[PDB]
Design a protein around this ligand. Structure first.
Ligand SMILES: Nc1ncnc2c1ncn2[C@@H]1O[C@H](CSCC[C@H](N)C(=O)O)[C@@H](O)[C@H]1O
Ligand SMILES: [Zn+2]
Ligand SMILES: [Zn+2]
Length: 883
């Protein structure tokens, strides 16, 4: 009927050679060879266009049909070349990109093109079910070419029926793909929408001649039929006669590096940290400079200089575990697990979103409630115990050789390992120097080093996930910390003994008993909700409440303590890695006055403390003691301590608090919706709607705490034991990974054994974990020593790191030292110990009953013998498998 529809009919009529002739005939294209090589490798610093679309947006804006600015939203970012070109534009200030990804379709690619620091991308989003947000510039490249116009219409109509919802929130500029603009209903609807919102339709000559695709843009204005018939006419004419010459152009070069951004950070207290700053400058005045392109909004930028790049993302596999776990090759939750990206790139692309936040400054009423609760808790904790100056002797008592230097200055660059330094009086001479400066009120050396952590974590986009930041200080400063405050860890101030709610020291064996005991106490449901990125949410006021313990010290101890707190905690100076433009890599120095780092000596202590403060506050709001205006200012202060000294311990012993994570059993269900003080402090609940009621639980076995939910089991004779559990796939994945680069197969086998005896010790109740662990200890020589680290949890002491037999260690930890089990009879054989319930083992990730696990289970000894052969025969193996 129409000039377009006939062209489509003809296009379908054709054959393959005519297809080829027409498709490329006489359009413009870009030199994409450079780019496709850079994509083959993934050279982020090249600064090349990740897709074709970057040119399409370039043409649209440089010709002047689009006026992009401010907050930009890319719908269907795909690779993200639209977003990546957006980043470059002078007036843009934030780029959000949404797409689907998953099986078959494109996932977002990550590069270091100019302004990448404002690019937040996400996948797994069927934007139809996503709500609208107020963008300044709206982009949508969502089309889906097909043969029949029947579908082109329907799909473009679905697209528009979606994007209207967004458009009615008045974007300053917009560009949306319109696949099918050539039919009756389409011309109609496009005319109506052009009337009701403006804009105009433009055809890009870069696009292939095989579709009628057009773009709907803000800056232009034109009648629909007129442009549609221009495109239809030219498309038709191009068909017959000569195959007209293609036009070559060069692809846009995006540049590289970061972009200048809103600097809304708090100004620094120059005389606390100035000594450290100007020391660093005096050291590196060779190449010292101030980069104008900084991606940091909340940190005070103090300068940068050239440095060498650190870490990598490469991830090695432990063939022992893998070849023993062939049937798990299909599950994504296992194969997708890999290393964390600890390059400056991978550090920063987590930093800029997770770490670069500034918390809502809580109101004076919540401020006063926090200081009150913290004062009461400092009183009640320091009743039995009292502080003390910790000694050099105890420091070297604790120390072992595998800790980190923190090599910052020249004077500290002598040693290589800890046990070497600790026995050299030069070290302690410098410690005494920094101490006698601290007592005078000047900080010279206590400076933070920072890099991303090496973790085994889920892969995102089918790629290495970004590394969360870890920052710690040089060892001497850690000694100052320890002598001042380390007594909190040493004397077990957070132990359940003294505290009641804390569990400082208790291993993963015992904690379930705490959960059951808590469950026997009557009340409402059990409520465990994880706080979103705890460390970054800590405010000045929380730190100043944690400094109140100094009330109970003596004057020397308080002098050193407050010195270290103020010049260290409440004013922090950091050295961080950033990747510069065109390859080179640099070090930046920044400061701030809130949050806490995971490399502080009393991280666990302080976190558990203020977390207890928060849980107390939430129980006060839940049980209606805190009224709704007391956020603003405190009415009847007294009635806080009236409650605390009536029920404070009574509620406290209904808590299990471990640093970041928490578990509570309140009196009634109102705790589920007493979120307002919780929100005011800035301690939001992770990835749940900020104001929605909390998901509680009834049966205590299904409570997750420190990534584990605990289950009770009766022995085959009669006694009862409590064991920790989690999802199998996580542990099999963790085992698969090899932390070290360039490691001989020996130490990878050592790791494999470490994991094996970890499973035997802890997750024996899992059929596949016991099976595979016995297979590992069998196929691995029982000679060799277990080395490496398994799961970073502090509640794993390291009890499986010895060639001792695991039956005896099992008896020791689960019976002989088992304080919650009276009957001391050590059971003599493995297969007496029961597995978990079949339905629950299936639920937590087991593959029992399925044919891969059957086939692999029957051929276990063939594979194990193959492992022995590949390692090297005539080494002392042992066949643990009996059954
Ligand atoms: N409704 C939807 N929401 C998000 N992504 C979608 C989608 N429908 C398709 N996609 C995926 O997202 C991509 C959109 S096209 C990619 C173009 C990209 N914006 C660029 O700058 O070059 C497609 O490859 C498709 O696989
Ligand atoms: Zn200092
Ligand atoms: Zn379980």
């Amino acid at each position: 009927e129409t000039l377009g529809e006939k062209w489509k009919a003809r296009l379908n009529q054709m054959s393959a050679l005519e297809f080829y002739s027409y498709k490329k005939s006489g359009i413009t294209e870009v030199c994409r060879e450079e780019a496709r090589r850079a994509l083959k490798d993934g050279v982020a610093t090249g600064g090349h266009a990740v897709s074709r679309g970057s040119a399409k947006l370039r043409w649209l804006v440089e010709r002047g049909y689009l006026q992009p600015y401010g907050k930009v939203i890319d719908l269907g970012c795909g690779r993200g070349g639209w977003s990546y070109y957006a980043a470059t534009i002078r007036k843009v200030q934030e780029v959000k990109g949404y797409t689907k990804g998953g099986p078959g379709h494109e996932e977002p690619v990550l590069v270091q093109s100019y302004g990448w620091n404002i690019v937040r991308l996400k996948s797994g989003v069927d934007v139809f079910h996503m709500a609208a947000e107020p963008c300044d510039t709206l982009l949508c490249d969502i089309g889906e070419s097909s043969s029949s116009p029947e579908v082109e219409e329907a799909r473009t109509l679905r697209v528009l029926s979606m994007v209207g919802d967004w458009l009615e929130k008045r974007p300053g500029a917009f560009c949306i793909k319109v696949l099918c603009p050539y039919t009756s209903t389409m011309m109609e609807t496009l005319e109506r929408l052009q009337r009701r919102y403006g804009g105009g339709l433009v055809r890009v000559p870069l696009s292939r001649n095989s579709t009628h695709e057009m773009y709907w843009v803000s800056g232009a204005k034109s009648n629909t039929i007129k442009s549609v018939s221009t495109t239809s006419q030219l498309l038709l004419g191009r068909m017959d006669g000569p195959r007209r010459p293609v036009k070559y152009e060069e692809d846009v070069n995006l540049g590289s590096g970061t972009r200048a951004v809103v600097s809304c950070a708090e100004a620094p207290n120059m005389k606390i940290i100035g000594n450290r700053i100007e020391r660093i400058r005096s050291e590196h005045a060779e190449t010292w400079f101030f980069d104008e392109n900084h991606p940091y909004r909340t940190w005070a930028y103090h300068g940068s200089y050239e440095a060498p790049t650190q870490g990598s993302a490469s991830s090695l596999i432990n063939g022992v575990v893998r070849l023993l776990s062939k049937p798990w090759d299909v599950v994504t939750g296992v194969t997708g697990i890999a290393m964390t990206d600890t390059t400056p790139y991978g550090q920063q692309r987590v930093f800029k979103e997770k770490v670069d936040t500034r918390v809502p400054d809580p109101q004076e009423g919540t401020r006063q409630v926090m200081s009150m609760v913290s004062s009461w808790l400092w009183k009640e904790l320091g009743k039995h115990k009292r502080p003390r100056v910790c000694t050099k002797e105890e420091f070297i008592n604790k120390v072992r050789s595998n800790a980190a230097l923190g090599a910052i200055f020249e004077e500290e660059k002598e040693w290589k390992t800890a046990v070497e330094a600790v026995n050299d009086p030069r070290f302690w001479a410098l410690v005494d120097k920094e101490r006698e400066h601290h007592l005078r009120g000047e900080c010279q050396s206590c400076v933070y080093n920072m890099m991303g952590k090496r973790e085994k974590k889920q892969g995102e986009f089918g790629k290495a996930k970004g590394s969360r930041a870890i920052w710690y200080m040089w060892l001497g400063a850690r000694f100052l910390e320890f002598e001042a405050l380390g007594f909190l860890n040493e004397d077990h101030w957070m132990g359940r003994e003294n505290s009641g709610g804390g569990v400082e020291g208790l291993g993963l064996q015992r904690l379930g008993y705490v959960l059951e005991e808590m469950s026997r106490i009557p009340g409402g449901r059990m409520y465990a909700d994880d706080t979103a990125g705890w460390d970054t949410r800590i405010s000045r006021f929380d730190l100043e409440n944690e400094a109140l313990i100094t009330n109970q010290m003596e004057k020397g101890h308080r002098a050193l303590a407050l010195a270290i707190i103020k010049y260290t905690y409440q004013n922090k100076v950091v050295k961080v890695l950033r990747p510069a433009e065109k390859g080179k890599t640099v070090m930046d120095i920044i400061s701030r006055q809130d949050q806490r780092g995971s490399g502080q000596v009393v991280t666990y202590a302080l976190n558990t403390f203020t977390n207890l403060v928060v849980q107390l506050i939430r129980n006060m709001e839940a049980e209606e003691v805190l009224e709704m205006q007391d956020l603003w200012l405190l009415r009847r202060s007294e009635k806080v301590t009236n409650w605390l000294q009536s029920n404070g311990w009574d509620r406290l012993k209904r808590m299990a608090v471990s640093g970041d994570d928490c578990v509570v059993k309140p009196i009634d269900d109102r705790f589920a919706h007493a979120l307002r003080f919780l929100n005011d402090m800035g301690k939001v609940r992770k990835d749940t709607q900020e104001w929605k009621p909390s998901t509680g639980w009834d049966n205590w076995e299904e409570v997750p705490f420190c990534s584990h939910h605990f289950n009770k089991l009766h022995l085959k004779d009669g006694r009862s034991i409590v064991v920790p559990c989690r999802h199998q796939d996580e542990l099999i994945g963790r085992a698969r990974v090899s932390p070290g680069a360039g490691w001989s197969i020996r130490e990878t086998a050592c790791l494999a054994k470490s994991y094996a005896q970890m499973w035997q010790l802890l997750y024996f109740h899992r059929r596949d974990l016991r099976l595979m662990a016995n297979a590992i200890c069998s196929s691995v020589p029982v000679d060799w020593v277990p080395t490496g680290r398994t799961t970073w949890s502090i509640h794993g002491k390291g009890e499986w790191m010895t060639t001792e037999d695991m039956l005896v260690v099992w008896n020791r930890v689960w019976i002989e030292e088992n304080d919650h089990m009276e009957d001391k009879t050590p059971v003599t054989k493995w297969t007496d110990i029961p597995y978990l319930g079949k339905r629950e083992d299936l639920w937590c990730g087991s593959l029992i009953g399925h044919r891969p696990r059957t086939t692999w289970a029957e051929n276990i000894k063939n594979t194990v013998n193959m492992v022995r052969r590949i390692i090297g025969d005539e080494e002392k193996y042992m066949d643990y498998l009996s059954t």
